[PDB]
Design a protein around this ligand. Structure first.
Ligand SMILES: *Cc1c(COP(=O)(O)O)cnc(C)c1O
Ligand SMILES: *Cc1c(COP(=O)(O)O)cnc(C)c1O
Lengths: 8, 320, 320, 8
């Protein structure tokens, strides 16, 4: 789980 | 004045306002470019249109024929959405199911065909599903905001000029939160061409400060900190990378509302915070810094930006 | 261009846009005055400032001394709030505890001192508590949007002129949803002075059509249908009262988003619906009607305006 | 109870 929870 | 042919002619030309009491201690001067005043509250209303429009012009897409596809649980979804709606394009958006309800209600309201992905796979899972859908779709067309040149090109054509002409050409620094990088790269390049002395300051999360040698990680400043260097970003144009924490940004965003009457998104608190720090550096006395406020704070009522006031609001009972 | 001294100088001067596919069948032409583009998404950003400003000028109030008080679970709360924040005035707002959470999170974010009242007493209970508070407060000052002349006076000074100059003086009709009446009365009066032939059409709920002999009742078109004739309203200026149902308005509001890329509040669907009906009357072929879109639809995500898309959004699961 | 639950 590589944090890829960005909001763009 | 005249009447807009349609909502798309309402994009851009956002106002500039001075930060007054939040900028206490500054010898420099800070003006905020309110992108929160875009037709749909954010700066993405710009690239939403640009990316569509550029494809149409290049003959790559036709309304009612082409199917726009893009993975995004952010403002780009809305930007594209309202623009696809006005222009008559079917839009498909992918995003982790995690993304709160309110963020879907809005895309749906525009006739967006929403596809939620494994919340555990984050945007990586959303991106997959998107390409999977692209493969399946005959007239499918993925925009790719991090790759698409129409992203920064629009900021170079509008955002940048607008700032230049709005500041009287007196701008000394341009503070921009970096998400895709299209804004800082597009607008930045233009301002630089007008005055080579214009310094560009990029803003990233202290928790995911990759442009500063940092390792990518999770932060709460929605809109920035992608955890990787986007293709559209032109790091050579950046004069300095300022880092801000989620807490700083949140506090600033909150001060902007209480002291300035500016209800901004957390990423705006980020740029505001950075811009102010810079404005407080003695050597910058007299300098005009223009910081971009990417979005309006009302779209983030559920987020951590309002946890305090929110709990307070739910805990309050009525007085007789 | 120049830089705003503060957020208050950002009020007004909202854009005009043509309604294209929702106006199908019209021989007349409909342009929407997007008040949803106000600093805080609604038309009340105008009177919020005006009422404050007019008191200051009349020396009736002083920042940090006077305590602004007003009963309102509507956009007036926000309008006053952000303006009080920027100007440094303590603001107290009263409203039935009923009013959803989100509507408080926002006032609180601006430093508003919220006082909820018996949800069963509606605005009547809110109004009481407000005067009760006024009695108790030494430097208390209640604005009274339905009584305050600064309400319509601002529309006569800004809104009206803006429309006149934006339509090229070619406006034939002005469609306005009536809440306090300040808009239709202020702007209306001005337009009438420019051209006596300019017809003013007021819009009220078919469920509470009191200006048409109707008895007051409950409706869902937030922003209008006060169930009584406000003091600031000048019924003599109204050329015709158009009635619209909650359902009509909601459907229109939904069409405005899907077909026009305009995410408007339900009251905007009301004016839009009325304006279009008028524009479809054969005798009005060639006429320009300007309908006011009071607020942006994102502030009403919890309301019935999105019940459909909302249930759909919650019912959707993720795709693997 | 006279409906006075308006949002203005
Ligand atoms: C897109 C976005 C940004 C950053 O802008 P870029 O042009 O992508 O660098 C910042 N904040 C929000 C809320 C955004 O949506
Ligand atoms: C105030 C308001 C109106 C009506 O405007 P008036 O100037 O009060 O007649 C309509 N819709 C909304 C959402 C409002 O807040």
């Amino acid at each position: 789980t590589e944090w890829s929870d960005y909001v763009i | 004045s005249r009447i807009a042919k349609d909502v798309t002619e309402l994009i851009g030309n956002t106002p500039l306002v001075y930060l007054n009491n939040v900028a206490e201690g500054c010898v420099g001067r800070v003006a905020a470019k309110l992108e929160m005043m875009e037709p749909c509250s954010s700066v993405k209303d710009r690239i939403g249109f640009s990316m569509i429009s550029d494809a149409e012009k290049k003959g790559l897409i036709k309304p009612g024929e082409s199917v726009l596809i893009e993975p995004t649980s952010g403002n780009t979804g809305v930007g594209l959405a309202f623009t696809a709606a006005a222009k008559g394009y079917k839009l498909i958006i992918t995003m982790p199911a995690s993304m709160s309800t309110e963020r879907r209600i809005i895309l749906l309201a525009f006739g967006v065909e929403l596809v939620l992905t494994d919340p555990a796979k984050g945007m990586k899972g959303a991106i997959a599903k998107a390409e999977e859908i692209l493969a399946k779709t005959p007239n499918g067309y993925m925009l790719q905001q991090f790759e698409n040149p129409a992203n920064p090109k629009i900021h170079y054509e509008t955002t940048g000029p607008e700032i230049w002409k709005g500041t009287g050409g007196k701008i000394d620094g341009f503070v921009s939160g970096i998400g895709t990088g299209g804004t800082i790269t597009g607008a930045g390049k233009y301002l630089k061409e007008q005055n080579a002395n214009v310094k560009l300051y990029g803003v990233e999360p202290v928790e995911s400060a990759i442009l500063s040698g940092g390792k990518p990680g999770p932060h709460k400043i929605q809109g920035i900190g992608a955890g990787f260097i986007p293709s559209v970003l032109n790091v050579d144009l950046i004069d300095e990378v300022v880092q801000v924490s989620s807490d700083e940004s949140i506090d600033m965003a909150r001060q902007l509302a209480l002291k300035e009457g500016l209800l901004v998104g957390i990423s705006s608190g980020a740029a505001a915070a950075a811009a102010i720090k810079l404005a407080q550096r003695p050597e910058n006395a007299g300098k005009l810094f223009v910081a971009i406020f990417p979005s309006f704070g009302e779209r983030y009522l559920s987020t951590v930006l309002f946890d305090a006031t929110r709990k307070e609001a739910e805990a309050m009972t009525f007085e007789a």
